[PDB]
Write a protein that binds this ligand. Structure first.
Ligand SMILES: NCCCC[C@H](NCc1ccc(-c2cccnc2)cc1)C(N)=O
Length: 426
């Protein structure tokens, strides 16, 4: 019926003085833009069709053409950034926002999807969607007693669009808009559907990606326990953003970090630090590195949960990027830990896998490790044990690796490599 039209025929139809001929051609445009192998999006834009589509959004009297042009537009908006730009420059935004209140859910859903692609494109369009007043009628669509009564795809759609209004930085979303969206987000974070849960987690991880004031307004809503619980989920699409949000929160103050520990997060980490998925292991170690950079009582809680052997583990064998995070975790730990805590880290076997990494030709992990070896020696000084530690380091070929580091380009590598040699080796 409306399949395989040319662009010139779509144009002929959309230009006629006949609403039905136009509906027909609009639907033809929609199918053409929906095709899987390269849809002629730029041919449609060049044909001048977007202002016509956008004007059909207003045809209250003809809901089917509202729907087809809506859909045609979202196919273009979901394309590249300049394609999205074309849609916004057609005056689509206030037109789509008016459609959120449409009696027809198939049309409201379409406007939700459109707005999510426009907002998701970047900071300026996100903020422009918010200025045109999108947030109120978006939140109005979830003002039901129980979310379980909404259509599943409809709910995933709204959730996904809210996550895009939380997304991007420079600038981050307006505080006013975040505070307005945040309560609905908390509610969706408790909804039982894996995709609504993944999108909400992403929303939260976008909001926690910033300065402590931002982390605070999220933490203050009490989502951290629900985050930790999702950190435990079986679905990798839920764990991945849940771990990102937790990882963000512990880059904040000691008190915010402590909220995560109190929530029971550390009990999940033996799994996370041995996870078969490389990125989960990378983010979990990065998270550990921000927890061992906190207070001594927080370092101690890492110890009490039996997490130090898992750090020794990651340091020993992991993707190199994860090993770098692990070395940071160790340096932070050795930097702010008590003498007892640093001693324990040596008993768990940190020295040898530490030394092995001094063979990595990455200048900044070497700095980090040499700094860590230095912190450990200072703990050994307060016990007159620089002795035994030197022997340990010597026995796993750790001295050979530091001697040789007295011939590695970098300034700080020598002045530490040399210094260590002078100070603790004959
Ligand atoms: N809860 C506090 C979070 C901030 C930590 C801060 N500085 C310590 C530090 C240094 C380097 C890293 C790092 C760099 C690259 C990759 N991974 C980890 C992380 C932390 C501090 N409190 O002392």
């Amino acid at each position: 019926g409306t399949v395989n039209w040319s662009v010139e025929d779509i144009v002929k139809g959309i230009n006629s003085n006949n609403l039905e001929s136009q509906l027909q051609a609009t639907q033809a445009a929609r199918k053409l833009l929906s095709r899987e192998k390269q849809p002629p999006i730029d041919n449609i834009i060049r044909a001048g069709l977007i202002p016509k589509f956008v004007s059909f959004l207003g045809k209250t009297d003809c809901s089917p053409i509202q729907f087809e042009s809506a859909w045609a537009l979202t196919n273009i908006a979901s394309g590249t950034s300049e394609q999205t730009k074309a849609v916004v420059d057609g005056g689509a935004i206030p037109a789509f926002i008016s459609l959120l209140a449409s009696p027809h859910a198939h049309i409201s859903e379409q406007a939700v999807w459109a707005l999510g692609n426009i907002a998701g494109d970047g900071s300026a369009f996100r903020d422009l969607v918010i200025k045109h007043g999108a947030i109120d009628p978006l939140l109005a669509l979830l003002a039901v007693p129980d979310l379980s009564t909404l259509a599943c795809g409809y709910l995933r759609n709204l959730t996904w669009t809210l996550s895009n209004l939380c997304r991007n930085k420079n600038p981050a979303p307006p505080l006013d808009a975040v505070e307005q969206i945040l309560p609905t987000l908390v509610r969706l974070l408790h909804h039982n559907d894996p995709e609504v849960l993944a999108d909400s987690c992403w929303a939260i991880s976008y909001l926690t990606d910033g300065p402590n004031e931002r982390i605070e307004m999220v933490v203050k809503k009490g989502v951290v326990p629900q985050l930790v619980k999702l950190l435990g989920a079986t679905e990798l699409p839920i764990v991945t953003p849940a771990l990102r949000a937790i990882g963000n929160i512990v880059t904040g103050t000691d008190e915010q970090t402590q909220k995560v520990i109190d929530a029971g997060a550390l009990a999940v980490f033996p799994s996370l630090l041995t996870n078969p998925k490389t990125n989960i292991q990378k983010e979990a170690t990065w998270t550990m590195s921000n927890i061992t950079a906190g207070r001594q009582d927080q370092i101690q809680q890492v110890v009490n949960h039996g997490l130090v052997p898992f750090l020794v583990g990651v340091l020993s064998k992991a993707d190199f990027k994860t090993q770098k995070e692990a070395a940071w975790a160790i340096t932070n730990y050795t930097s702010g830990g008590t003498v007892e805590q640093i001693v324990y880290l040596v008993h768990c076997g940190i020295i040898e896998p530490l030394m092995n990494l001094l063979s990595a030709k990455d200048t900044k992990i070497i700095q980090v490790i040499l700094d860590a070896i230095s912190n450990i020696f200072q703990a050994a000084e307060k016990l007159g044990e620089t002795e035994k530690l030197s022997i340990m380091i010597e026995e796993c070929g750790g001295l050979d690796k530091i001697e040789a580091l007295q011939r590695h380009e970098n300034e700080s590598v020598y002045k530490a490599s040399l210094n260590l040699i002078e100070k603790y080796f004959s």
